[PDB]
Tab-separated table of C-alpha atoms in Angstrom:
chain	number	residue	atom	x	y	z
A	6	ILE	CA	0.018	0.042	0.206
A	7	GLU	CA	2.988	2.090	0.281
A	8	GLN	CA	4.575	2.682	-3.285
A	9	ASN	CA	0.987	1.268	-4.799
A	10	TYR	CA	-0.949	4.345	-4.012
A	11	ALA	CA	1.787	6.905	-5.094
A	12	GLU	CA	1.835	4.952	-8.404
A	13	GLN	CA	-2.023	5.511	-8.587
A	14	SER	CA	-2.093	8.984	-7.307
A	15	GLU	CA	0.519	10.112	-9.780
A	16	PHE	CA	-1.283	8.889	-12.722
A	17	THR	CA	-4.575	10.098	-11.622
A	18	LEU	CA	-3.490	13.518	-10.589
A	19	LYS	CA	-1.916	13.765	-14.362
A	20	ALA	CA	-5.166	12.585	-15.864
A	21	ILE	CA	-7.103	15.017	-13.893
A	22	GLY	CA	-4.743	17.697	-15.166
A	23	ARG	CA	-4.959	16.652	-18.800
A	24	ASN	CA	-8.727	16.593	-18.618
A	25	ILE	CA	-8.874	20.133	-17.025
A	26	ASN	CA	-6.943	21.419	-19.956
A	27	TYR	CA	-9.484	19.787	-22.313
A	28	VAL	CA	-12.357	21.615	-20.716
A	29	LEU	CA	-10.309	24.999	-21.447
A	30	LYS	CA	-9.537	23.821	-24.891
A	31	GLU	CA	-12.974	23.367	-25.687
A	32	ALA	CA	-14.037	26.700	-24.393
A	33	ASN	CA	-11.120	28.102	-26.417
A	34	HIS	CA	-12.487	26.439	-29.638
A	35	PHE	CA	-16.099	28.025	-28.683
A	36	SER	CA	-14.470	31.507	-28.033
A	37	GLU	CA	-12.660	31.266	-31.591
A	38	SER	CA	-15.625	30.056	-33.432
A	39	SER	CA	-17.963	32.870	-31.798
A	40	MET	CA	-15.495	35.985	-32.293
A	41	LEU	CA	-14.689	34.971	-35.798
A	42	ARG	CA	-18.456	36.052	-36.699
A	43	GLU	CA	-18.869	38.898	-38.898
A	44	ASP	CA	-21.627	40.256	-36.881
A	45	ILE	CA	-20.191	39.989	-33.700
A	46	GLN	CA	-17.211	42.079	-34.811
A	47	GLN	CA	-19.075	44.570	-36.683
A	48	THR	CA	-21.145	46.142	-33.876
A	49	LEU	CA	-18.132	46.247	-31.841
A	50	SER	CA	-16.361	48.396	-34.360
A	51	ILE	CA	-19.032	50.772	-33.598
A	52	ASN	CA	-17.368	53.705	-31.700
A	53	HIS	CA	-20.120	55.570	-30.346
A	54	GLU	CA	-23.564	54.826	-28.612
A	55	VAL	CA	-26.092	52.959	-30.524
A	56	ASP	CA	-29.947	53.099	-30.450
A	57	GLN	CA	-31.788	51.149	-28.052
A	58	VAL	CA	-33.112	49.205	-30.935
A	59	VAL	CA	-29.801	48.164	-32.289
A	60	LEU	CA	-28.682	47.374	-28.843
A	61	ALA	CA	-31.470	45.142	-28.014
A	62	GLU	CA	-30.552	43.369	-31.660
A	63	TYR	CA	-26.883	42.950	-30.520
A	64	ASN	CA	-28.052	41.795	-27.105
A	65	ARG	CA	-30.019	38.783	-28.881
A	66	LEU	CA	-26.993	38.161	-31.006
A	67	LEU	CA	-24.868	37.969	-28.063
A	68	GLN	CA	-27.581	35.697	-26.375
A	69	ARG	CA	-27.640	33.334	-29.376
A	70	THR	CA	-24.009	33.425	-29.921
A	71	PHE	CA	-22.636	32.954	-26.543
A	72	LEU	CA	-25.331	31.435	-24.220
A	73	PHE	CA	-26.170	28.235	-25.779
A	74	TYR	CA	-22.623	26.593	-25.125
A	75	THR	CA	-23.635	24.504	-21.911
A	76	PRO	CA	-21.130	26.000	-19.501
A	77	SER	CA	-21.041	29.418	-21.077
A	78	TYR	CA	-22.253	31.717	-18.190
A	79	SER	CA	-21.839	35.437	-19.488
A	80	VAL	CA	-20.139	37.495	-22.014
A	81	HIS	CA	-18.641	41.104	-21.769
A	82	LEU	CA	-17.596	42.617	-25.199
A	83	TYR	CA	-16.107	45.970	-24.948
A	84	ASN	CA	-13.897	48.421	-26.877
A	85	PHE	CA	-11.688	51.223	-25.374
A	86	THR	CA	-13.939	54.048	-26.810
A	87	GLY	CA	-16.531	53.662	-24.422
A	88	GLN	CA	-18.910	50.899	-25.515
A	89	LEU	CA	-19.889	47.514	-23.565
A	90	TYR	CA	-22.276	44.860	-24.312
A	91	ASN	CA	-23.018	42.225	-21.953
A	92	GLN	CA	-25.516	39.228	-21.584
A	93	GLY	CA	-25.439	36.251	-19.371
A	94	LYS	CA	-27.335	33.690	-17.403
A	95	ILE	CA	-29.111	34.325	-14.180
A	96	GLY	CA	-27.185	35.811	-11.571
A	97	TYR	CA	-24.307	36.922	-13.675
A	98	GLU	CA	-22.181	40.078	-12.504
A	99	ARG	CA	-22.564	43.117	-14.548
A	100	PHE	CA	-19.234	44.663	-14.889
A	101	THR	CA	-18.885	48.630	-15.012
A	102	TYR	CA	-17.157	49.705	-18.006
A	103	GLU	CA	-14.650	51.564	-15.682
A	104	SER	CA	-13.638	48.228	-14.155
A	105	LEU	CA	-13.179	46.558	-17.345
A	106	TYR	CA	-11.152	49.506	-19.032
A	107	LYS	CA	-8.791	49.887	-16.057
A	108	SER	CA	-8.571	46.417	-14.968
A	109	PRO	CA	-4.719	45.250	-14.411
A	110	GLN	CA	-5.741	41.975	-16.215
A	111	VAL	CA	-6.186	43.966	-19.394
A	112	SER	CA	-2.413	44.550	-19.771
A	113	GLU	CA	-1.860	40.913	-19.518
A	114	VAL	CA	-4.579	40.442	-22.137
A	115	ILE	CA	-2.712	42.667	-24.647
A	116	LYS	CA	0.355	40.861	-24.362
A	117	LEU	CA	-1.075	37.566	-25.148
A	118	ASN	CA	-2.287	39.387	-28.393
A	119	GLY	CA	-5.135	37.313	-29.244
A	120	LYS	CA	-4.470	34.052	-27.041
A	121	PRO	CA	-6.853	33.840	-23.998
A	122	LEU	CA	-6.079	34.607	-20.374
A	123	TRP	CA	-7.555	32.079	-18.247
A	124	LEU	CA	-8.369	33.419	-14.415
A	125	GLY	CA	-9.385	30.553	-12.028
A	126	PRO	CA	-12.027	30.804	-9.521
A	127	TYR	CA	-11.133	33.657	-7.084
A	128	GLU	CA	-8.440	34.586	-9.205
A	129	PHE	CA	-10.263	37.601	-11.000
A	130	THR	CA	-10.308	40.368	-8.329
A	131	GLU	CA	-13.092	41.983	-10.004
A	132	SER	CA	-15.536	39.234	-10.087
A	133	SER	CA	-16.877	39.116	-6.668
A	134	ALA	CA	-20.122	37.941	-6.919
A	135	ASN	CA	-19.794	34.437	-8.349
A	136	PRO	CA	-16.055	33.687	-7.576
A	137	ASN	CA	-16.530	30.093	-8.418
A	138	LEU	CA	-16.598	31.062	-12.188
A	139	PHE	CA	-13.640	30.512	-14.449
A	140	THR	CA	-12.822	33.607	-16.544
A	141	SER	CA	-11.341	33.795	-20.065
A	142	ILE	CA	-10.177	37.108	-21.529
A	143	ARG	CA	-8.650	38.021	-24.841
A	144	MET	CA	-8.073	40.691	-27.352
A	145	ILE	CA	-10.250	40.625	-30.401
A	146	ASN	CA	-9.779	42.096	-33.709
A	153	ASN	CA	-6.412	45.746	-31.708
A	154	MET	CA	-10.499	46.488	-31.407
A	155	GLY	CA	-11.819	45.099	-28.286
A	156	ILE	CA	-11.764	42.781	-25.432
A	157	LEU	CA	-13.842	39.548	-25.073
A	158	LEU	CA	-14.482	38.685	-21.224
A	159	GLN	CA	-16.350	35.501	-20.870
A	160	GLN	CA	-17.291	33.668	-17.583
A	161	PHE	CA	-17.837	29.936	-17.270
A	162	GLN	CA	-19.602	27.634	-14.838
A	163	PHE	CA	-17.185	24.483	-14.787
A	164	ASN	CA	-18.330	23.034	-11.239
A	165	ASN	CA	-20.226	19.942	-12.829
A	166	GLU	CA	-17.188	19.253	-15.429
A	167	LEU	CA	-14.540	19.538	-12.835
A	168	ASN	CA	-16.358	17.501	-10.412
A	169	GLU	CA	-16.955	14.688	-12.845
A	170	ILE	CA	-13.344	14.639	-13.538
A	171	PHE	CA	-12.283	14.307	-10.062
A	172	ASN	CA	-14.855	11.411	-9.645
A	173	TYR	CA	-13.897	9.767	-12.818
A	174	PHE	CA	-10.295	9.791	-12.592
A	175	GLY	CA	-9.533	9.706	-8.821
A	176	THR	CA	-12.562	8.301	-6.979
A	177	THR	CA	-11.331	4.884	-8.086
A	178	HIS	CA	-9.982	4.063	-4.643
A	179	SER	CA	-12.348	5.918	-2.392
A	180	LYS	CA	-14.903	8.830	-2.520
A	181	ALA	CA	-13.231	9.738	0.647
A	182	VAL	CA	-10.635	11.824	-1.292
A	183	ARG	CA	-10.610	15.399	-1.345
A	184	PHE	CA	-9.426	17.229	-4.613
A	185	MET	CA	-8.454	20.608	-4.583
A	186	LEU	CA	-7.291	23.053	-7.456
A	187	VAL	CA	-4.706	25.642	-5.953
A	188	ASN	CA	-2.797	28.240	-7.656
A	189	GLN	CA	0.762	29.317	-6.618
A	190	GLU	CA	0.002	31.540	-3.808
A	191	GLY	CA	-2.011	28.558	-2.167
A	192	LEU	CA	-5.354	30.157	-3.074
A	193	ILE	CA	-7.792	26.907	-2.714
A	194	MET	CA	-9.745	28.105	-6.103
A	195	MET	CA	-11.798	24.905	-5.926
A	196	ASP	CA	-12.566	22.145	-3.127
A	197	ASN	CA	-14.479	19.370	-4.404
A	198	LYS	CA	-15.926	18.918	-0.805
A	199	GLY	CA	-17.310	22.816	-1.011
A	200	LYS	CA	-16.022	23.565	2.306
A	201	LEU	CA	-12.577	25.215	1.773
A	202	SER	CA	-13.092	27.274	-1.509
A	203	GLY	CA	-11.553	30.598	-1.641
A	204	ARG	CA	-9.221	29.969	1.639
A	205	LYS	CA	-5.755	29.322	1.834
A	206	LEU	CA	-3.874	25.904	1.692
A	207	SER	CA	-1.573	26.869	4.546
A	208	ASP	CA	-4.350	27.054	6.725
A	209	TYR	CA	-5.355	23.858	6.711
A	210	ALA	CA	-2.417	21.770	5.814
A	211	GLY	CA	-0.195	20.800	8.765
A	212	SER	CA	3.049	20.626	6.842
A	213	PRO	CA	4.292	22.503	3.826
A	214	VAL	CA	2.811	21.349	0.491
A	215	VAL	CA	5.132	21.683	-2.454
A	216	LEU	CA	3.112	23.586	-4.983
A	217	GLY	CA	4.528	23.656	-8.288
A	218	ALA	CA	6.029	20.258	-8.319
A	219	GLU	CA	5.335	17.687	-11.042
A	220	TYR	CA	4.608	15.298	-8.438
A	221	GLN	CA	5.191	15.087	-4.712
A	222	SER	CA	3.227	13.562	-1.710
A	223	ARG	CA	3.552	13.767	2.061
A	224	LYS	CA	1.998	12.552	5.003
A	225	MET	CA	0.570	14.986	7.203
A	226	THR	CA	-2.511	16.318	9.305
A	227	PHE	CA	-5.128	18.150	6.720
A	228	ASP	CA	-8.300	19.676	7.941
A	229	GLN	CA	-7.885	17.572	11.280
A	230	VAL	CA	-7.399	14.407	9.347
A	231	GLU	CA	-3.928	12.194	9.332
A	232	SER	CA	-3.792	12.098	5.552
A	233	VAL	CA	-1.439	11.479	2.432
A	234	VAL	CA	-1.422	14.752	0.331
A	235	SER	CA	-0.455	14.896	-3.288
A	236	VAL	CA	0.634	17.676	-5.364
A	237	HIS	CA	0.700	17.962	-9.593
A	238	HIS	CA	1.497	21.172	-10.999
A	239	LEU	CA	-0.367	21.805	-14.382
A	240	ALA	CA	1.749	22.678	-16.929
A	241	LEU	CA	-0.563	25.520	-18.046
A	242	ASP	CA	1.526	28.634	-16.796
A	243	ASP	CA	2.097	31.467	-18.869
A	244	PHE	CA	4.692	34.150	-17.385
A	245	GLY	CA	3.283	33.065	-13.995
A	246	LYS	CA	-0.382	33.085	-15.120
A	247	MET	CA	-2.557	30.273	-14.788
A	248	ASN	CA	-0.187	28.708	-12.303
A	249	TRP	CA	-2.192	26.012	-10.872
A	250	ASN	CA	-1.912	22.746	-9.018
A	251	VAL	CA	-4.124	19.773	-8.386
A	252	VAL	CA	-4.029	18.545	-4.787
A	253	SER	CA	-5.616	15.738	-3.474
A	254	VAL	CA	-6.079	14.521	0.184
A	255	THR	CA	-6.617	11.015	1.329
A	256	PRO	CA	-7.269	9.775	4.800
A	257	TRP	CA	-4.522	7.401	5.881
A	258	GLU	CA	-6.739	5.058	7.260
A	259	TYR	CA	-7.715	4.119	3.819
A	260	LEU	CA	-4.052	3.054	3.021
A	261	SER	CA	-3.430	1.172	6.362
């Protein structure tokens, strides 16, 4: 039960990592296809306020274009001349034009030069109504910015259960960024909190695979970590962390 669970855990965490990447790639394909659309580009090119009738027609285009992809939750489309269009599912946060125009993330998006910036749960400081959302931001065409939020709780939970509940359903899985922010907790208890506040010993974030026995949130456990190879100049610096009760391995 010694080396065996480490064999199993390294495979499982890597598979979880690949499947999270697949979810993002699928959202990327969805964003790419939507933003190539002639009609999407056109009204964003408008450098001035539009009629209320043209607005409601563009809102309906945004609804039909962006909100029928299952995990799509909201879209904000804006230029730097004062125009902002947004639609979304029930409960979505409407961001102010100022907060989007001035957001520090904008500078990073521009450097990515069309590629998407992904912000995990709790990573997008401007998005405080619904911190569980993932956020994708990309430059669209020197012209505007496409800012999308996604509900991925179901999809990531399925990934955890499919690839990592194989031994026990007792296992906790977390997505944790480089600062130790617990972006998601599959037990629904620790989201938004600090990994160092619940792990009794250091957890080596950033490692390909590292495993250590320690107390975690009051349970003697094996804690394993796998860094996702998704980081881009220190953005998207994410890790999968699993916590298994030691009793299940003794």
